[PDB]
Write a protein that binds this ligand. Structure first.
Ligand code: A1IL5
Lengths: 722, 77
């Protein structure tokens, strides 16, 4: 049989090649580079419905401390106790920062006040800092512009001798994370292509076939990146450096996998003795639907991230799905077309011999004695859960960027002279219709401050009644400036600046948020301010919410992706238990990938996994593992009719080397993102790489064939097979 | 065509043996250099060439090609 679309691609091959190339050039010229769009259409880090976001907005609006979620800390450091020259320079800097109303919405200038100066000066006296509130939420282009403007102002002001200034804070850290992620993109792609070229040259052993495969992959990659850039430029989608990097790597790996499937089936058909036209038609009949299933599975898996809560997951839905729906159509059309055009000149005939003796022997060893093999590999797959009790997630984005980053460099200026919690303050605000100016409510405020000072892990409570944060007046001249910054202008609300001992952001620190809330409630209970509203904001509260939401979004994304992949495989194969197995044998095998990744990062390298890693890696692992299993099961579907068990052996003999090559190429592509400056991207890539090595070496090789041999004809229920 | 022709076909395909090379008098292990797993795969393949299951102990009677032909001409029933 010669299927229709195969005939049409066969007749119009050269026009198709030139059409896709023209589209590539048109898109690359008529819209900017995708990374440039990412820095033009980036998303805000915080979700909108988070209490830690509403609280910060409310505090900012009530206390007139701007209208943004973002805040940035300016650090002043010196090689000696800061003299009056430091104060003059700081006054000039704060005046200039105030002049820039477009970006700096407010400046919590405390070091300029001799009274509260002790509350921000380093205990050594060699450093000081001031909190700025910048327009635009964390990570948005407005915040990026604001942090760049503040940084330029700080670093252009003439520093006195022996004094240095830095900029820090979540906003600057996010901006620098974006810029460093887009700075390493060229290197990621260069190393990916170099490694693939060094690898594929040892598989096909002729440079022409490798070069044509890589050109097909490049056309796919550029078309996908270009379409996603078009959508981003049109404003229909947000973006993040994670989305761009994952899209690039996934497009490269998946395009190489489709090209490898195409060439592998064509070369097997040629080795069997079929001529060029019949070989191409067999290639299409045996790989056209496998590639489409592979594309839709990955697209609908990465699309399931669109249901996540956190923006760092929610924004990976549309861009990745569009990139994979583009890279697949280009694969399905340029692949067969370029294959046929090259077949005119005899480029894609196999140079080596497609020896299959080893895989047929393994197939007869696994089909015979299926259940022992299934048990033997289920033991390996499930022992990866032993790392679960010791798994510890780290929320400190500060550590996963290079030390030369200006934001990270500024943080070092705090560690050298401050406790590591000073640059991560947490703010508690109480609001009521009463006027807090009255002395009785001031005693209530003091009771609240004392109560929260008792909370574990809390070191300092800088408040209206605690100008320097330590234990100790409403009419004094210096105390008036405390009114100007620690009570609302109407007197209806009061804010408490809270500092921790140790990192507030760590899993230990964030749990204190509930303790702080409870202690505040006990202090306010049985008191006239009991009716006063309470809000919590800062890094601690923010990442407490992130910890709460990440579990749910990971779970929902994983479950939805599993169901969608199952539906796609059921459509492709039309066998219920078959489709169930194709994805179940991968879901069970997620334990091995998780265990290996934890054992490599957390235990061996002593680097905890970033909270993004599992969510961004499981979605790809499910899809790609199910794709390899789909290839194998579709080959079963083909070869069956020569015996239910013998077809399994023949199918392994045929597709054994193809899937190994595709799996190694994909895993090494994902494992090549460790080169990225964002160590978070490195963790994601390495987790997916280890997982897919496990799949391609064990799951599809022993689990699926063993289950197929065990289930007899029930593997294809309801399909009637003799 | 006849049973013998296509059992010959499967033996040849399993062992990589040429059509003119395989013969009734030849033995799988010595003359054709067949492996033990090759014999297991070959018997399993005949189990689906004809709907007849061969017990493991019954696989002791498959030493040579002529034995396979004469065994399966009767056990095809
Ligand atoms: C979510 C993505 C899903 C898969 C899409 C595949 C995309 C590649 C397009 C290749 C070129 C074909 C174009 C037309 C397709 C439209 C349907 C159509 O025109 N019709 O409806 C006729 C019914 C008989 C089909 C016939 N199939 C058969 O007669 C039976 C049924 O399945 C098989 C079979 C399947 C795979 C491998 C070996 C097989 O023996 N034998 C067979 O030639 O294939 C199919 C052409 C393609 C195929 O591979 N799958 C079919 C797809 C839909 C029908 C049922 N269904 O669910 C499938 O699996």
């Amino acid at each position: 049989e010669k299927p229709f679309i195969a005939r049409m691609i066969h007749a119009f091959a050269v026009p198709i090649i030139l059409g896709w190339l023209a589209v590539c050039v048109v898109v690359t010229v008529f819209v900017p580079s995708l990374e440039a769009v990412g820095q033009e259409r980036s998303v805000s880090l915080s979700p909108k419905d988070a209490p830690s976001f509403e609280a910060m907005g409310r505090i900012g609006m009530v206390f007139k401390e701007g209208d943004s979620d973002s805040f940035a800390m300016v650090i002043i450091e010196g090689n000696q106790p800061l003299g009056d020259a430091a104060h003059k320079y700081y006054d000039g800097l704060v005046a200039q920062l105030r002049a820039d109303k477009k970006h700096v919405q407010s400046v919590q200038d405390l070091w300029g006040d001799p009274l509260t100066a002790a509350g921000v000066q380093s205990n050594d006296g060699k450093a000081a800092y001031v909190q700025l509130s910048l327009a635009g939420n964390q990570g948005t282009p407005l915040a990026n512009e604001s942090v760049e403007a503040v940084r330029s102002i700080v670093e252009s002001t003439p520093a006195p001798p022996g004094i240095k200034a830095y900029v820090t804070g979540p906003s600057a850290l996010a901006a620098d994370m974006h810029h460093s992620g887009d700075r390493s993109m060229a290197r990621i792609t260069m190393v990916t292509v170099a490694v693939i070229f060094i690898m594929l040259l040892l598989v096909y052993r002729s440079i022409i076939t490798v070069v044509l495969l890589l050109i097909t992959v490049g056309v796919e990659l550029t078309a996908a990146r270009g379409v996603v850039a078009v959508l981003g430029h049109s404003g229909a989608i947000g973006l993040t450096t994670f989305a761009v990097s994952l899209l690039t790597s996934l497009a490269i790996a998946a395009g190489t996998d489709y090209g490898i499937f195409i060439i592998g089936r064509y070369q097997e058909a040629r080795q069997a003795g079929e001529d060029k036209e019949a070989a191409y038609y067999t290639m299409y009949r045996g790989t056209a639907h496998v590639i489409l299933g592979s594309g839709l599975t990955i697209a609908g898996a990465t699309f399931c991230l669109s249901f996540a809560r956190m923006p760092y997951f929610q924004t990976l839905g549309i861009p990745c799905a569009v990139g994979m729906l583009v890279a697949v159509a280009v694969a399905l059309t340029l692949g067969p077309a370029v294959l046929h055009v090259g077949s005119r000149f005899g480029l894609f005939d196999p140079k080596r011999l497609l020896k299959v003796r080893g895989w047929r022997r393994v197939g007869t060893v696994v089909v015979r004695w299926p259940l022992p093999v299934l048990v033997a590999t289920c033991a390996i797959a499930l022992v990866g859960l032993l790392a679960l009790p010791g798994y510890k997630t780290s929320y400190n984005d500060r550590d996963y960027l290079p030390d030369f980053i200006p934001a990270n460099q500024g943080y070092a200026a705090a560690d050298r002279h401050f406790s590591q919690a000073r640059m991560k303050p947490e703010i508690l605000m109480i609001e009521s219709d009463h006027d807090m100016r009255n002395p009785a409510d001031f005693l209530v405020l003091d009771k609240l401050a004392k109560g929260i000072f008792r909370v574990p892990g809390i070191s300092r409570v800088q408040a209206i009644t605690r100008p320097e944060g330590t234990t100790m007046v409403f009419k004094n001249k210096d105390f008036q400036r405390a009114m100007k910054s620690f009570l609302s202008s109407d007197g209806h609300a009061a804010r408490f600046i809270i500092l921790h001992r140790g990192d507030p952001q760590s899993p230990e620190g964030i749990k204190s948020i509930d303790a702080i809330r409870t202690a505040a409630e006990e202090s306010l209970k049985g008191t006239p301010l009991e009716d006063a509203k309470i809000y919590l904001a800062g890094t601690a509260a923010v990442f407490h919410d992130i910890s709460e939401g990440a579990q749910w979004d990971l779970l929902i994304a994983a479950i939805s992706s599993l169901c969608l992949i199952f539906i796609i495989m059921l459509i492709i194969t039309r066998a219920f238990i078959a489709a169930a197995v194709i994805v179940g044998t991968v879901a069970l095998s997620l334990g091995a990938s998780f265990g290996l990744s934890v054992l490599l990062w957390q235990h061996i390298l002593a680097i905890h996994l970033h909270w993004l890693v599992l969510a961004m890696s499981v979605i790809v692992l499910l899809a790609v593992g199910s794709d390899y299993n789909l290839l194998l099961v579709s080959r079963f579907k083909q070869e069956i009719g020569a015996g239910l068990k013998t077809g399994i052996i023949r199918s392994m003999g045929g597709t054994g080397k193809v899937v190994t090559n595709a799996g190694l190429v994909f895993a090494v592509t994902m494992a090549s993102m460790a080169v990225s400056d964002l160590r978070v991207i490195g963790q994601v890539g390495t987790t997916i790489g280890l997982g897919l090595l496990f799949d391609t070496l064990i799951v599809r090789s022993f689990m699926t064939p063993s289950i197929a041999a065990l289930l007899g004809r029930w593997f294809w229920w309801p399909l009637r097979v003799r | 065509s006849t049973i013998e022709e296509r059992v010959k076909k499967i033996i040849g395909e399993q062992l990589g043996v040429k059509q003119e090379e395989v013969t009734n008098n030849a033995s799988f292990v010595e003359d054709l250099g067949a492996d033990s797993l090759d014999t297991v795969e070959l018997v399993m393949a005949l189990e689906e060439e004809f709907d007849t299951e061969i017990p493991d102990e019954e696989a002791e009677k498959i030493t040579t090609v002529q034995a396979a032909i004469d065994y399966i001409n009767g056990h095809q029933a």
